[PDB]
Amino acid sequence: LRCMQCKTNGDCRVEECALGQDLCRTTIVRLWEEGEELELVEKSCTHSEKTTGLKITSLTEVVCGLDLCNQGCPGSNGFHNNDTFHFLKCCNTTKCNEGPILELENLPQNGRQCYSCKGNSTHGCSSEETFLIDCRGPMNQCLVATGYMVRGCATASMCQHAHHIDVSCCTKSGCNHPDLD
Amino acid sequence: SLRCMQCKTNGDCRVEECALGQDLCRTTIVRLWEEGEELELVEKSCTHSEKTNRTLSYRTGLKITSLTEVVCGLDLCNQGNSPGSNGFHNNDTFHFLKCCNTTKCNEGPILELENLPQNGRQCYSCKGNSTHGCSSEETFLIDCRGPMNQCLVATGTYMVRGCATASMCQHAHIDVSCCTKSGCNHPDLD
Numbered sequence: 001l002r003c004m005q006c007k008t009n010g011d012c013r014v015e016e017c018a019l020g021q022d023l024c025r026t027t028i029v030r031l032w033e034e035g036e037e038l039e040l041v042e043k044s045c046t047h048s049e050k051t052t053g054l055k056i057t058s059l060t061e062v063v064c065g066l067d068l069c070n071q072g073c074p075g076s077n078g079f080h081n082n083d084t085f086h087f088l089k090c091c092n093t094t095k096c097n098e099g100p101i102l103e104l105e106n107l108p109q110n111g112r113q114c115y116s117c118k119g120n121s122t123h124g125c126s127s128e129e130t131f132l133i134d135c136r137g138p139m140n141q142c143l144v145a146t147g148y149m150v151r152g153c154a155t156a157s158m159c160q161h162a163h164h165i166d167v168s169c170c171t172k173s174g175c176n177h178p179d180l181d
Numbered sequence: 182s183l184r185c186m187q188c189k190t191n192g193d194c195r196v197e198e199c200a201l202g203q204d205l206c207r208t209t210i211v212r213l214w215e216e217g218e219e220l221e222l223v224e225k226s227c228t229h230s231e232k233t234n235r236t237l238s239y240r241t242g243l244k245i246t247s248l249t250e251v252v253c254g255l256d257l258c259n260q261g262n263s264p265g266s267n268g269f270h271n272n273d274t275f276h277f278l279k280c281c282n283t284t285k286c287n288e289g290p291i292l293e294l295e296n297l298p299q300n301g302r303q304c305y306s307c308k309g310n311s312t313h314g315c316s317s318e319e320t321f322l323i324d325c326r327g328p329m330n331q332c333l334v335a336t337g338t339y340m341v342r343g344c345a346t347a348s349m350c351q352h353a354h355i356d357v358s359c360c361t362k363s364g365c366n367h368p369d370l371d
């Protein structure tokens with residue numbers, strides 16, 4: 001028996017089916033969501049045989065203001081600083097949250113304010129380069145991490161272990177002031 | 182200031198406060214028709230008419246695709262871990278690599294090993310190591326398929342034999358030797 005074996009962007013063949021493959025199949029998968037319509041059609045040989053993972057998505061964003069400066073589980077946790085933003089979402093595929101992740105500049109701010117800095121203790125996260133920022137979105141705790149030092153806004157999910165490479169979190173505005181670590 | 186519907190594919194569909202300089206709302210519909218594929222994307226956003234040519238024009242990259250395939254005949258043996266094209270296809274494993282300039286690109290497919298036709302050449306096959314994996318008890322003759330019509334040997338400071346495309350044979354160097362007539366990569370011919 002010979003069937004059309006054709007994927008989109010795969011090998012499209014006239015195929016001699018294997019012994020025990022007594023059927024030709026054509027399948028049409030259609031998908032409708034907001035601002036997307038997709039139709040795939042595959043053909044192949046098949047046989048009547050009688051007889052769950054997790055998804056992880058991550059956004060990382062860096063902003064800058066100078067000229068041409070951009071050149072070169074079931075839970076979510078993010079950290080968003082004032083220069084860089086990192087969010088990580090993880091779901092069980094049976095019941096998954098496909099809601100999008102918004103970049104830093106689109107998150108509404110939450111009212112929290114935290115100090116922000118990056119780099120080594122003495123330079124980069126001195127209290128000369130450390131400045132207060134408004135937190136945005138779900139990152140409503142103030143975070144310090146050291147292992148080098150980073151400060152910013154964080155979600156509670158990112159504060160709960162706090163282990164090496166250690167993190168400290170606190171729930172009140174300004175609480176990550178540099179000589180309070 | 183201006184506010185537009187901002188909607189992406191699989192993304193954040195918002196009502197957006199546009200930037201001061203953004204005087205336009207954009208709606209964009211991209212449609213794609215290929216053999217056995219139809220796609221429609223709709224993205225809405227804020228935009229601005231930027232006048233003449235934007236500074237220091239544009240760029241054009243390279244697209245590179247690689248297929249790697251392993252077969253086995255044993256029971257649940259695929260459990261897990263446990264500007265041109267060149268391929269090598271062995272008897273167990275197949276690796277092909279295609280490279281194109283996006284302006285003139287060959288979107289032709291890469292076919293798995295079992296669907297490529299035999300080309301008539303036959304070469305020896307083994308991988309891994311002299312004592313184990315490329316003994317001449319573990320070295321077998323195989324029919325080559327598709328564009329892989331050369332017999333290849335390679336070794337490094339590990340050894341593999343198989344069928345190879347001329348693209349994979351045109352220089353040595355971790356050393357490679359190729360030959361064009363059947364059986365010529367026999368271990369007693371190195």
Ligand SMILES: *[C@@H]1O[C@H](CO)[C@@H](O)[C@H](O)[C@H]1NC(C)=O
Nearest residue numbers: 052053054091092093094095
């Ligand atoms: C996902 O959730 C279902 C119940 O909702 C459970 O039976 C299944 O084992 C879960 N899978 C994973 C990978 O957590």
Ligand SMILES: *[C@@H]1O[C@H](CO)[C@@H](O)[C@H](O)[C@H]1NC(C)=O
Nearest residue numbers: 240241242243282283284285
């Ligand atoms: C691609 O090829 C065209 C001519 O075929 C050439 O003008 C162009 O510069 C090439 N681009 C790259 C990135 O190689």
Ligand SMILES: *[C@@H]1O[C@H](CO)[C@@H](O)[C@H](O)[C@H]1NC(C)=O
Nearest residue numbers: 309310311312313314315339
């Ligand atoms: C070949 O067998 C294993 C690798 O599969 C390795 O331990 C062994 O040392 C190799 N033989 C020689 C002579 O290196």
